[PDB]
Design a protein around this ligand. Structure first.
Ligand SMILES: COC(=O)CCCCCCCCO[C@@H]1O[C@H](CO)[C@@H](O[C@@H]2O[C@H](CO)[C@H](O)[C@H](O)[C@H]2O[C@@H]2O[C@@H](C)[C@@H](O)[C@@H](O)[C@@H]2O)[C@H](O[C@@H]2O[C@@H](C)[C@@H](O)[C@@H](O)[C@@H]2O)[C@H]1NC(C)=O
Lengths: 218, 219
């Protein structure tokens, strides 16, 4: 199955530079033009660049031409994008995409990679969200993980390594004093927890911090 | 540069409904004749965008029959013959006939359903956190509709606070209900000074305020 995993991403200061990458899989890299698309904070979508199989023919939009340079490596089935003189407007999620033989642009998209242009980076502190009010409940027990004080975006929260997906409620990250924080809460049957164990996998990519937390009774 | 236009920017629609989104380009597109390169993208919450239609009406491999694309010249339309819950998200139209390639402003699809009451939960701060200088108590309101809710925090009842931070979860792709939280952040000391913490969720479905609490000490 075709894959596109982006790499790089994190905080870059204004005026600085970055080089993201995109390891392709599933298909013959050297046979398609490749792309880079960014989605800005207002979920606004933007085409960023494109490259031919040889990597001789390329084009970019005026908002990027000159500063960004897209290169490719066929021996390593990877796509690249060098960024220079980065400005704040350049803060976005960068997706490398693949087209369609028959006539389509972005038919296969990567997972994404966030580039943030500004000041400092910090890992969050992960705490257990456990019930306390002995309300007359039953059937459902709600647990969660609080990921407090990190920068920049994003953080990914898995539950039992992606097993629990139906009862996963993750709220938007609110911006504290120049920091983010969010909660992910899973609702599992009262028969399950505390019997079956429930773990939360938290990952802050911009600091390579990852941890699995195990919610146990207080 | 061909600027794409999309109408409307917001589209609340019920289930089983027929839905049309329009995309209008600054001027005719058409590349090397060979059809127009107009496409439709759907981005579901917390997921990468995805190709639905391309070549104006060529339904990308795997897109349900309910999705249809049409258009000619400058006007293009996407009909969702029969709206399903899995369709909430944002739809975009792309222009790949002229450089630069342009994406539309985006239209947001929202599913109007029947009212549903929240399910409150109170969460005491953890020892883990207390050691890290402060204490956060979070009140969780889950599976309600509409989004609009109100959350009040009472410190012993004697007063309400202003160091509260609210945030919502996206509409569910197969339940159509929201969920939100309301965190109250205090110091560890100020926390270890009061007895009970309360949360009163005042939502339309209920005439009575949903109240949940805990008294931080036993003996
Ligand atoms: C079944 O598996 C495979 O497909 C295996 C690989 C087979 C490759 C066969 C083709 C080899 C050459 O690659 C194609 O080159 C074309 C140009 O020579 C590309 O088309 C150009 O793409 C540009 C980048 O976006 C730009 O859009 C140009 O306008 C476009 O050229 C135009 O379209 C051509 C097809 C010709 O009609 C040309 O005269 C015209 O100017 C191919 O890119 C694809 O098609 C374009 C339209 C766009 O949809 C891309 O995303 C597509 O990938 C390119 N083919 C491939 C598969 O990369």
């Amino acid at each position: 199955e075709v894959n596109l995993v982006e790499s790089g991403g994190g905080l870059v200061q204004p005026g600085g530079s970055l080089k993201v990458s995109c390891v392709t899989s599933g298909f013959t890299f050297s046979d398609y033009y490749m792309y880079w698309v960014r989605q800005t904070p207002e979920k606004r979508l933007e085409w960023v660049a494109y490259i031919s199989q040889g990597g001789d023919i390329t084009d970019y939009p005026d908002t990027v031409k000159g500063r960004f340079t897209i290169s490719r490596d066929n021996a390593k089935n990877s796509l690249y994008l060098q960024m220079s003189r980065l400005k704040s407007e350049d803060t976005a999620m960068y997706y490398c995409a693949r087209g369609l033989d028959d006539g389509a642009w972005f038919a296969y998209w990567g997972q994404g990679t966030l580039v943030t242009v500004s000041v400092t980076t910090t890992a969050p502190s992960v705490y257990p969200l456990v019930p306390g009010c002995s309300d007359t409940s039953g059937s459902s027990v709600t647990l969660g993980c609080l990921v407090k004080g990190y920068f920049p975006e994003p953080v990914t929260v898995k539950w039992n390594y992606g097993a629990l997906s139906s009862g996963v409620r993750t709220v938007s990250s609110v911006l504290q004093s120049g920091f983010y924080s969010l909660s992910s809460l899973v609702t599992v049957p009262s028969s399950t927890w505390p019997s079956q164990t429930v773990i939360c996998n938290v990952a802050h990519p911009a600091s390579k911090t990852e941890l699995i937390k195990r919610i146990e009774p207080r | 540069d061909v600027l794409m236009t999309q109408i409307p920017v917001s589209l609340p629609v019920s289930l089983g409904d027929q839905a049309s989104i329009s995309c209008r380009s600054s001027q005719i597109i058409v590349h090397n004749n060979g059809n127009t390169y107009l496409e439709w993208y759907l981005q579901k919450p917390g997921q990468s965008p995805q190709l639905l239609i391309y070549k104006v009406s060529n339904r990308f491999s795997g897109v349900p029959d309910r999705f249809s694309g049409s258009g000619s010249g400058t006007d293009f339309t996407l009909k969702i013959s029969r709206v399903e819950a899995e369709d909430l998200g944002v739809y975009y139209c792309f222009q790949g006939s002229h450089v630069p390639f342009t994406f539309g402003s985006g239209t947001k699809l929202e599913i109007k359903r029947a009212d549903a009451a929240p399910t409150v939960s109170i969460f005491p701060p953890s020892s883990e956190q207390l050691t890290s200088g402060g204490a956060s108590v979070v009140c969780f309101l889950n599976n309600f509709y509409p989004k609009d809710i109100n959350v009040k925090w009472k410190i012993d009842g004697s007063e309400r606070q202003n160091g509260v931070l609210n945030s919502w979860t996206d509409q569910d792709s197969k339940d159509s209900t929201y969920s939100m939280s309301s965190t109250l952040t205090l110091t560890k000391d100020e926390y270890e000074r009061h007895n009970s913490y309360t949360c009163e969720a005042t939502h339309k479905t209920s005439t009575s305020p949903i109240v949940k609490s805990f008294n931080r000490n036993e003996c």
